[PDB]
Design a protein around this ligand. Structure first.
Ligand SMILES: [Ca+2]
Ligand SMILES: [Cu+2]
Ligand SMILES: [Hg+2]
Length: 290
C-alpha cells in the first residue's frame, strides 16, 4: 500500500470535484453559518476550533464503502465505510520536505468534559502547489474564472481515509500544472485527472466506556488506531515528505453499544456516547513545530 482509489467524474454527482471551505466552523446543520478565520497552519504553532459531525470520519450515512486491495487477507480490507467530505472540516498549510511537526486534535476548551469526540484526520499533498481551480466541476460550472475566497477543490463528497485519491474524466484542462521542482513522471499533471496523494491519517481509538465499541472497521484501519489513554484527543508526529501545499481533513468516530446498517442502508445505533451541546461538537486542531 497505500491503495489508490480512482473515481470517475460526474456532474451532478458524488465525484463532481466539489469545493470545500477553510473558514466554515459551525456544525453539520444550516442552522445559520459560522465562519472563522481561514485554517492556515503555515508557519505552525497555530490552532483553530471548529465543529465535526457525529459519524463524519467513518460514516455509514454516506451509503458508500470502498475496499483496500493492499491488505492481506483481502477479506480484512473490504466494505470500508467512507467519511463524509462536508461534515468533516478542512484546513491547509504550506511546508517543507523534512519539516517535523505534531498534529493534535482534542475537545475544545469549552467542551472539555462532554463526551463524544473521537477525532480523526487525513493529510494530503497537492503537487499543484496551491488551490486547484477546475472549470466545469460542481461549484465552478457557472462561468467562474477563479475559486471563491478561502476555498479549494476536492474529488468528491465521500472520502477515503487510507488511500491515494484520483479523479479521472474531468473536463479537459490545458493549464493543469505543478511548480518546477515536481517530478511530473511520479506526479503526472493530466489534462483530465488530478490526484490527492495520501500523507498520513489516524483516529482517536481510546473509548470513553470500555464495554462499548467504535463505529469503525474491524481490521482495515489497524495501522491508523491511535491509543494514548485519553478519549477525545489524539496526537501524532508527522514528517513532511515534500515541499509545498497540504490539505488536512478532520472528522469524528462515534462510540456506541451497537450499530447496524439495514437493507435500505439506514444507520441505527444504540447507547451512543454523544453528550453534545446546542452549538454542536467542537474540537481544536493544533499543529506545532516540533
Ligand atoms: Ca486518545
Ligand atoms: Cu459533500
Ligand atoms: Hg461531542
Amino acid at each position: 500500500g497505500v491503495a489508490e482509489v480512482v473515481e470517475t467524474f460526474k456532474n451532478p454527482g458524488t465525484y463532481s470535484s466539489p469545493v470545500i471551505n477553510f473558514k466554515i466552523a459551525s456544525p453539520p446543520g444550516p442552522g445559520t453559518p459560522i465562519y472563522g478565520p481561514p485554517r492556515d497552519f503555515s508557519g505552525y504553532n497555530k490552532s483553530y476550533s471548529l465543529a465535526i459531525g457525529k459519524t463524519s470520519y467513518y460514516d455509514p450515512t454516506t451509503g458508500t464503502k470502498w475496499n483496500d486491495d493492499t491488505i492481506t487477507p483481502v477479506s480484512d480490507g473490504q466494505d470500508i465505510w467512507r467519511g463524509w467530505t462536508h461534515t468533516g472540516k478542512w484546513s491547509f498549510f504550506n511546508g517543507k520536505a523534512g519539516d517535523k511537526i505534531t498534529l493534535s486534535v482534542q475537545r475544545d476548551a469549552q467542551e472539555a468534559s462532554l463526551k463524544g469526540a473521537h477525532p480523526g484526520f487525513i493529510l494530503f499533498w497537492r503537487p499543484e502547489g496551491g488551490p486547484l481551480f477546475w472549470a466545469g466541476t460542481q461549484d465552478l460550472d457557472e462561468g467562474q474564472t477563479a475559486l471563491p475566497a478561502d476555498s479549494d477543490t476536492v474529488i468528491g463528497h465521500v472520502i477515503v481515509q487510507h488511500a491515494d485519491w484520483t479523479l479521472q474524466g474531468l473536463p479537459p484542462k490545458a493549464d493543469h500544472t505543478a511548480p518546477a521542482g515536481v517530478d511530473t513522471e511520479l506526479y503526472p499533471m493530466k489534462p483530465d485527472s488530478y490526484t490527492m496523494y495520501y500523507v498520513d491519517s489516524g483516529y482517536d481509538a481510546d473509548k470513553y466506556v470500555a464495554s462499548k465499541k467504535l463505529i469503525m472497521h474491524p481490521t482495515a484501519f489497524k495501522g491508523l488506531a491511535l491509543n494514548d489513554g485519553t478519549a477525545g484527543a489524539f496526537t501524532k508526529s508527522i514528517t513532511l515528505p515534500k515541499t509545498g501545499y497540504y490539505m488536512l481533513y478532520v472528522a469524528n468516530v462515534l462510540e456506541v453499544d451497537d450499530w447496524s446498517v439495514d437493507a435500505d442502508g439506514k444507520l441505527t445505533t444504540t447507547g451512543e456516547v454523544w453528550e453534545v451541546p446546542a452549538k454542536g461538537c467542537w474540537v481544536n486542531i493544533t499543529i506545532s513545530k516540533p
